[PDB]
Amino acid sequence: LREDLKFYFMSPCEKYRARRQIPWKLGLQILKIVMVTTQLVRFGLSNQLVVAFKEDNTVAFKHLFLKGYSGTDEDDYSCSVYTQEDAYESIFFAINQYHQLKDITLGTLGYGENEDNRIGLKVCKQHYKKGPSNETLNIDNDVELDCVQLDLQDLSKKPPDWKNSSFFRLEFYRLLQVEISFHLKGIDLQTIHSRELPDCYVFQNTIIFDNKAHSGKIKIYFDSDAKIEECKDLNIFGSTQKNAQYVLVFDAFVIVICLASLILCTRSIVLALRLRKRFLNFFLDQWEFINGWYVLVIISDLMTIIGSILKMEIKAKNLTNYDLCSIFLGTSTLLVWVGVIRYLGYFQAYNVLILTMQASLPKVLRFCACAGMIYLGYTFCGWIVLGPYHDKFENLNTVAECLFSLVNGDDMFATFAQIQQKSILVWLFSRLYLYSFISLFIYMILSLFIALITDSYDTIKKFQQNG
Amino acid sequence: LREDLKFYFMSPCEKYRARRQIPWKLGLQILKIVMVTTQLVRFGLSNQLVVAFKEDNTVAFKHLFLKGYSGTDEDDYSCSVYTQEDAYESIFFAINQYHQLKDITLGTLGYGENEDNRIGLKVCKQHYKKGPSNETLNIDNDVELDCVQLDLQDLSKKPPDWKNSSFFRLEFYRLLQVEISFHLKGIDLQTIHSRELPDCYVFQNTIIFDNKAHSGKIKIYFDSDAKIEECKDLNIFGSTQKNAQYVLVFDAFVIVICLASLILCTRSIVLALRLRKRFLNFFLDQWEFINGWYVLVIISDLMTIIGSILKMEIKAKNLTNYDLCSIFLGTSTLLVWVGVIRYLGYFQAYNVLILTMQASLPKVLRFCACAGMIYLGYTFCGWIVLGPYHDKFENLNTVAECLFSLVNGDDMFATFAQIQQKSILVWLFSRLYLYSFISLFIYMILSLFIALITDSYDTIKKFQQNG
Amino acid sequence: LREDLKFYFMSPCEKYRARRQIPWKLGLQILKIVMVTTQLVRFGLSNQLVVAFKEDNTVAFKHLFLKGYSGTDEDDYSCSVYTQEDAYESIFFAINQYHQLKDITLGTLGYGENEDNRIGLKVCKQHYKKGPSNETLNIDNDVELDCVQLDLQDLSKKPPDWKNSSFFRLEFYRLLQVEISFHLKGIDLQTIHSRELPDCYVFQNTIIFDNKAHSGKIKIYFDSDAKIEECKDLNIFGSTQKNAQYVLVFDAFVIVICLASLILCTRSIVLALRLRKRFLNFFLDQWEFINGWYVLVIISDLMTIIGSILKMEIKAKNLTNYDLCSIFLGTSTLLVWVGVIRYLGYFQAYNVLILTMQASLPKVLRFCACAGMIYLGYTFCGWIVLGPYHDKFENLNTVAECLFSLVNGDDMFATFAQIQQKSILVWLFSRLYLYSFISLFIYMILSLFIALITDSYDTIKKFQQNG
Amino acid sequence: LREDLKFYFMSPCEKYRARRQIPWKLGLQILKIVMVTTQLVRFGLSNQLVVAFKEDNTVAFKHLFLKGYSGTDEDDYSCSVYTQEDAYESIFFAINQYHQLKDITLGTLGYGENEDNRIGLKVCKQHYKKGPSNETLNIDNDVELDCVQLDLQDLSKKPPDWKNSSFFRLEFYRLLQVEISFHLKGIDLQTIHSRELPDCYVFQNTIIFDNKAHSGKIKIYFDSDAKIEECKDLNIFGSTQKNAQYVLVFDAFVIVICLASLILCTRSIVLALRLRKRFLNFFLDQWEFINGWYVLVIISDLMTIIGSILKMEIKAKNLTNYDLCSIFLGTSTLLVWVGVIRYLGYFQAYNVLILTMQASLPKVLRFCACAGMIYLGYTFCGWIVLGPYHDKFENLNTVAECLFSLVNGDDMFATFAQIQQKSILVWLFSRLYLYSFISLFIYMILSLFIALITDSYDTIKKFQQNG
């Protein structure tokens, strides 16, 4: 029983000296790291190409349909117009470029059927109801909705009477929004060199001329949603795509091995907890017989299993919404590579470092509460005071990120210089605030982490040497 | 009496074990943090919308009335012109855009009455008195002031003779300033979806073509001052605004609870100081019976009270000048959230960290004097030497901010590279200066904070363990 | 024998007191540092001029032949076009500028003979074979190659029928690439003031209008390859270039002295290893008699020898591909200047610092494994999750560089702000990821280096003082 | 004698208790800091205005006379042209703008007499002598110099035959340089509001169209040299400037007090050195009786004296070349404010910090040699390898500044990303280089400063406590 406990608590390098104790339970993990990492790598390299094609097409559409687009968006919208004539020019430019698409596009593009199954362009208006521009406003608080369909045989009639229509009498003082929507077909023909059957895309596009604010500016949003659809009629010679089976079977293998690892870890947690029960019953050492790394391994395997299920679901139904699956697979890989530290601890001279890391969290995290109370106080004060006058302090989230950057010393001179001296009182308070915060956190609080970590090191070092 | 002193000096977790000692005095504070923080949050979320509307309108006005405005100002002024014809073009552009406002604005704008109660545009000139452009200047040191009113029925006469008037013979060698001023009305109609009565604004605008320097450049300043006025005649259906009462009553509650907390803290300071008098009289422990946190709490509550008074004053009189009120409320919230640390000290394992923080100021602040003498010396030397040749060293304030950034390691390579090699002597001195300063402060002085903080940690740790 | 071992293990300052022991073996090294450093300096100052001329000519060519070039490239290509007409305009612009080169260039340029020994311009197309723009694509997966030669007496015929040719019917839906290629001659006439014979260059230029992606954008690549050729017929009065002999003989001297130093070091390693054999045989001190600095010196000299051989080879055959030779010479110089620390250790008060540096690697490098496992986990997770949404996380290499920067605190606020809030799930994960990583590495792991280095210092300090 | 030594070695706070020992020797210094600092402040505030006027005029001239100037220079030159027609357009634009100056300037400008005492414009050419554009160059290695004078009555003749002159047949293949030079008069009329007599300026301007490189680009340099001259005939009513006397007399007072302080310090060094001689003779304590602060004070006063002499010289002769005087005054002020630390040491609890600072240089500076050998090795290797491929590594000075920034952690991610992957070998070496350097200096060497400073702190702390 003493030998049993010694065996249960030792390492595999020492356990191997038993005449039948081969380390296959470790071999499974050594397989698992490689299999999971290669699954992640192949998934990422596949995902990247689809993302690149979709975003390249989005940029090309922005250049084609937005007048005067400079190639870079504003903070959340592609471009803006401040003049009543510029809005008309942009609105008509988008329609005229849609009309001429076949003669100006460099891609494999074509027209797609719309919601009415027509090939055509739909544009809609939203005006506050009940038509001077002030002093007597007779508005009535709800929205008129108007829409019109512009088809190719309309937008082409040599005399484009559609510009002269009564629809486009916009009355910008009532106007909330103008929306232009259309469908396009594309092909990622780049893939043809592999002799795989090229896949089509269907792009659903909307251009939003948005002025909910009524603050003298119209914001132009461009949004593009792509579906894979199905090659309608591509007579391109070559072969179809079936590699999908090689993805599905590999995901099945990954799921199987992760389940096997989870079974092994749960079994090990059971046997050892029983041994503790045996130890408790034996005679009138620590209560925690469970190896902590098994919890991490179990979590890793569960997340890998569910993430692989999501990936198989996405591929089977031919989706491109990779957010949640990417999160599960990435976090699982993170925990798997963290779990490798379990095997460095056996070799000595890493052990004191690992023990220092493990022993330092219970005090670093306790320091973070005392520091966080002050950090929250400065977050609220900075947001309320410097917010109207400083780009970094616009909202509590950005204030928190800015202060966290300042604690680590990043981008500090710009933080001082970015606030204008329009109000001397607020500027003086800004200097007081910034000097106080930076001094308090960099020269004292940040160094207390150094103090704590250094002193936690010496205890473990002196414990290890004293024994 | 011994039990009394023990009770007076202990914690509420231990004090609760007395048969009648419920912690209501702490419950009041736990209410107060929440109430003050929610007051700050609601104030900020209200303030942000008004600021956003005013600044969006300012940007729209800059785009409308400034010729060739690029969307970003220069360092303190919107744009500048260097040519005699460009000044005329900008001056006439502003007037022509004002004339056509109804046909070019995307907002709810309209014309506002001016100082003479006319609807019109006022422009004024300031020329050095006493009319070649040099070698014989007959100037006489004081300013001619000329003004003219341009009304809509003047600026509209098909033949705009106002451009041909003798007023605009500017003689830029004598010219100090040309100022264009007008009033506009606006509505933040965005709010209408809440069925609150929309509020109007009145914008007072001035465009200043400023060349006091006479240095070959005219600086164009745009300034816009907004008042809330009063919806003149908006027949928009819906309801008026009364929520203001919900703000006033909530501020009243906040003031009441802050006064209650202040009363409790002052009472506690009195009773305890008397106990010290009793202790002094008792027999032939430390002189400081007063809990230091009460001073912070009293200051916090006083600032909250006066800030809430200012907020109620602003809302009652319908102002938008939030600077001082924001300062009081933000600093009060900062101190309130700092005061939470009082309650972490009871739980142990935060106590050594709090004691280290409290014990480290009396030596960090004493080090700051010895460091500050050197820092001041470098500030003066950098300002006098590198100031004409380096954008960061233009004035003592910016020199101080730059050096404080350099001590923390920020934006260092740009600091070296930003000075041109026009003069080799000054460049060599700049390298000597920057290497000396950065070495002295980063590798020695900055690390002395680490030394001080780490060693202050060990005293408290060894005091706590030794007892 | 005891005196022998004492002599063998001491320093030259003490060894000099023997009646015949002059330090010539150190004099050779003191010569070697200077000779190698001056070789590097002269090589770099020569290389820089050729690189500057070639790159200045490349920039001038980009301005001449690329329509609307702004002076700065995009991330890997000079400029791009998104419209079917812009591609034609750029393609014809390049040819027209080539036709008019004699009248628009500011340099000493001239036309160079092409592959067919003609003076002329070659342009080629690559179209997917087998000619609507979709729904029925009859492509057949391999490439048509077409080329045509445009000579000066063609591109000049007053009626430039070459624009009307059937060649330029591009059919951009099939188009892979259009390539324009030509030769130019130049002279670095700047050198003439030295009365050295000026050298010619031959520039081989290719302009690639590349749209392999078919993603609605054509990428324009400009590449220029320069050869030295040979002054064809420059009647400029002066003298030819022969200094090359002064380079060759100096390289020969450097090789000779480096071989001598290597011989001395290998001889010293032999004698001392024998002494250890003698010490082993003497009686029933440490096994490592070899001085570690000799290994560094031998490596330095070998790399210097082979690098100088490569430099002589380059100069003899008149190449300009300096990559590998620069690597050998630079690394050799790095190791040579590192080897100087050998001589600071003799003077005391540097010895404890050198011993601390030497004693700290065996634990810093062991900590790097435990830290690297976590760092790899975060690299994979960041690449898979934030990659589609963040410019810094596009690929594993850039993720590794970004995380390594973040550990050192660089460019942190931009790292937070650069990811858009398009997807709330990914944004929340990004905040979790960034706060966790930055906290874990800056406040704990980075400070463990401080702990390790500080404690390694005290052991050596206390060992040195105790003896 | 024992009391004498005690008096000589104590502090003024204790020395004051002698019945006649008033601290006037300290009062002189307390006066001196204020007087020197105010001299520096007044000098800087005066210098700044003249610099601002001169540079504002320079920017206005750049906008007036350079075609298409964008408002920001290139790295050392205002703008560049790459096409043979652009050079002609810029050259003629400068002359035409000079011709029309009276009608386009916004300043008080006027024409100034040239070297021939004419009012006129001089332009000069420099062509390699001995007139195809290659394959047969008949150049002869020295420079033709041609010049022509364009006067106002020439540049005005309605038919400006000067453009058609044979002078402007530039032959850009031989051309080295074209230079345009002219004189202007200006007035800083801004000062008139003080009723001081406004001062004139004379601007000497040169525009250099420089293509020494012959690398396909012409660089356009603009240089402007301003002299104060003397108001020629300004009939502006007011008063002349005499405050200059208030500057001269104040500088005289500063010189007098600095000489007095130097006399006192030298006298104190003499008396104390004699006392040491007395102490040596007294009987069979440390050799260094001299107070170290006196050396700093003497240096400060000498530099202040010579700097004030230079300032008086500059003002008397009406110069604007402030470089050397600014250096002396700034360094003197730096040392004066450093000398204040002498008086903080008396108050205790600063003494241990000052002693730690003084005791830490003899080991930080010794560590800097061992670190500097490695730093030099990396400087040479980086310059030779990454120099052709990285903007930060162009030359040894910039390499040194970049590496010094990297040691302090600044601008690191850009340092990785700024090198293109054109050559995979150099890119791989760049990653090896950057990771090795950053790891070695940040995680080990930089932390050794923390170790040294922290341990130097504890010795002084334990010495001070043990006594």
Side-chain angles (χ1 to χ4, degrees), chain C residues 337-448:
Chain C
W337 280 89
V338 171
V340 172
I341 294 172
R342 179 180 166 204
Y343 313 136
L344 300 178
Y346 301 142
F347 293 168
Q348 184 171 338
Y350 309 105
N351 190 41
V352 316
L353 311 175
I354 295 162
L355 286 171
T356 302
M357 277 163 23
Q358 290 179 359
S360 301
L361 292 163
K363 56 200 70 178
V364 171
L365 275 57
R366 288 187 170 102
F367 187 42
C368 294
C370 299
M373 294 300 293
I374 305 189
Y375 172 95
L376 289 178
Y378 279 85
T379 297
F380 289 120
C381 179
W383 172 57
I384 201 75
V385 184
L386 308 183
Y389 298 107
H390 199 315
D391 280 325
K392 295 193 174 190
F393 294 79
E394 285 285 0
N395 54 42
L396 289 166
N397 165 242
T398 314
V399 179
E401 296 168 5
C402 177
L403 293 186
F404 186 79
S405 304
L406 257 61
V407 178
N408 305 326
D410 185 46
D411 194 32
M412 197 180 309
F413 180 70
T415 303
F416 285 100
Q418 183 162 200
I419 175 160
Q420 66 272 22
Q421 198 170 339
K422 162 294 190 193
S423 179
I424 191 65
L425 178 62
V426 178
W427 180 89
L428 285 168
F429 186 88
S430 82
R431 299 312 186 246
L432 178 63
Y433 177 99
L434 290 171
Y435 291 129
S436 175
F437 181 77
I438 298 162
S439 304
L440 178 60
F441 277 82
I442 303 192
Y443 308 151
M444 180 174 297
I445 290 175
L446 181 70
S447 45
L448 196 74

Side-chain angles (χ1 to χ4, degrees), chain B residues 235-406:
Chain B
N235 314 359
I236 313 170
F237 281 30
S239 174
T240 183
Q241 184 178 121
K242 196 56 174 179
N243 51 60
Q245 302 303 327
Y246 310 154
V247 176
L248 266 289
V249 76
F250 184 78
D251 292 341
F253 295 168
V254 173
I255 290 161
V256 170
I257 72 177
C258 292
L259 215 60
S261 171
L262 182 147
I263 289 290
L264 262 64
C265 297
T266 53
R267 182 176 181 153
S268 304
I269 288 177
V270 158
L271 189 89
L273 271 200
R274 288 179 177 178
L275 173 79
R276 205 247 301 180
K277 193 170 183 175
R278 182 180 182 180
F279 173 79
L280 177 61
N281 288 1
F282 173 69
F283 182 69
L284 178 144
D285 303 317
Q286 185 57 278
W287 296 104
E288 191 165 49
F289 275 46
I290 293 178
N291 189 337
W293 295 112
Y294 292 138
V295 181
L296 200 80
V297 173
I298 287 163
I299 292 167
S300 305
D301 298 345
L302 287 172
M303 284 165 105
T304 297
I305 292 161
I306 70 185
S308 191
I309 288 285
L310 266 57
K311 192 163 66 72
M312 278 189 321
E313 224 74 356
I314 281 170
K315 183 54 127 143
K317 316 198 334 213
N318 206 7
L319 284 37
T320 68
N321 183 31
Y322 304 113
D323 293 357
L324 182 61
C325 181
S326 304
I327 285 166
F328 285 124
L329 297 178
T331 307
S332 180
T333 302
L334 163 63
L335 300 180
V336 167
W337 280 89
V338 171
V340 172
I341 294 172
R342 179 180 166 204
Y343 313 136
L344 300 178
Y346 301 142
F347 293 168
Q348 184 171 338
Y350 309 105
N351 190 41
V352 316
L353 311 175
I354 295 162
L355 286 171
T356 302
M357 277 163 23
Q358 290 179 359
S360 301
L361 292 163
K363 56 200 70 178
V364 171
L365 275 57
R366 288 187 171 102
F367 187 42
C368 294
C370 299
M373 294 300 293
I374 305 189
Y375 172 95
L376 289 178
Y378 279 85
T379 297
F380 289 120
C381 179
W383 172 57
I384 201 75
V385 184
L386 308 183
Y389 298 107
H390 199 315
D391 280 325
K392 295 193 174 190
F393 294 79
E394 285 285 0
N395 54 42
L396 289 166
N397 165 242
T398 314
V399 179
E401 296 168 5
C402 177
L403 293 186
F404 186 79
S405 304
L406 257 61

Side-chain angles (χ1 to χ4, degrees), chain C residues 48 102 104-105 108-109 185 187 192 233 235-237 323 337 340 350 397 401 408 410 457-458, chain D residues 84 133-137 139-141 366 373 389 394 411-413 423 427 431 435 443 452 455:
Chain C
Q48 181 156 39
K102 274 334 208 303
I104 69 171
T105 189
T108 326
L109 259 62
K185 304 192 183 93
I187 298 160
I192 196 53
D233 295 297
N235 314 359
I236 313 170
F237 281 30
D323 294 357
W337 280 89
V340 172
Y350 309 105
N397 165 242
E401 296 168 5
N408 305 326
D410 185 46
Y457 179 53
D458 273 300
Chain D
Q84 184 166 317
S133 77
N134 209 299
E135 305 289 5
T136 63
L137 291 185
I139 297 179
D140 286 281
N141 192 188
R366 288 187 171 102
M373 294 300 293
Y389 298 107
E394 285 285 0
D411 194 32
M412 197 180 309
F413 180 70
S423 179
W427 180 89
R431 299 312 186 246
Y435 291 129
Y443 308 151
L452 291 164
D455 296 2

Side-chain angles (χ1 to χ4, degrees), chain C residues 16 48 79 84 152 164 176 215 280 309 435:
Chain C
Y16 176 62
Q48 181 156 39
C79 63
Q84 184 166 317
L152 292 174
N164 200 32
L176 294 89
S215 62
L280 177 61
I309 288 285
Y435 291 129

Side-chain angles (χ1 to χ4, degrees), chain B residues 9 19 42 54 69 84 96 135 148 150 153 161 174 239 254 280-281 320 358 366 370 378 412 420 427 465:
Chain B
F9 279 119
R19 74 290 192 176
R42 292 208 300 148
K54 288 169 58 183
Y69 180 69
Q84 184 166 317
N96 279 285
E135 305 289 5
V148 68
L150 305 178
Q153 63 305 14
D161 61 354
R174 303 198 294 128
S239 174
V254 173
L280 177 61
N281 288 1
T320 68
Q358 290 179 359
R366 288 187 171 102
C370 299
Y378 279 85
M412 197 180 309
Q420 66 272 22
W427 180 89
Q465 290 191 339

Side-chain angles (χ1 to χ4, degrees), chain B residues 383-440:
Chain B
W383 172 57
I384 201 75
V385 184
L386 308 183
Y389 298 107
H390 199 315
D391 280 325
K392 295 193 174 190
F393 294 79
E394 285 285 0
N395 54 42
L396 289 166
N397 165 242
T398 314
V399 179
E401 296 168 5
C402 177
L403 293 186
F404 186 79
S405 304
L406 257 61
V407 178
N408 305 326
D410 185 46
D411 194 32
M412 197 180 309
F413 180 70
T415 303
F416 285 100
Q418 183 162 200
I419 175 160
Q420 66 272 22
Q421 198 170 339
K422 162 293 190 193
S423 179
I424 191 65
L425 178 62
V426 178
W427 180 89
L428 285 168
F429 186 88
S430 82
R431 299 312 186 246
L432 178 63
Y433 177 99
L434 290 171
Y435 291 129
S436 175
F437 181 77
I438 298 162
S439 304
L440 178 60

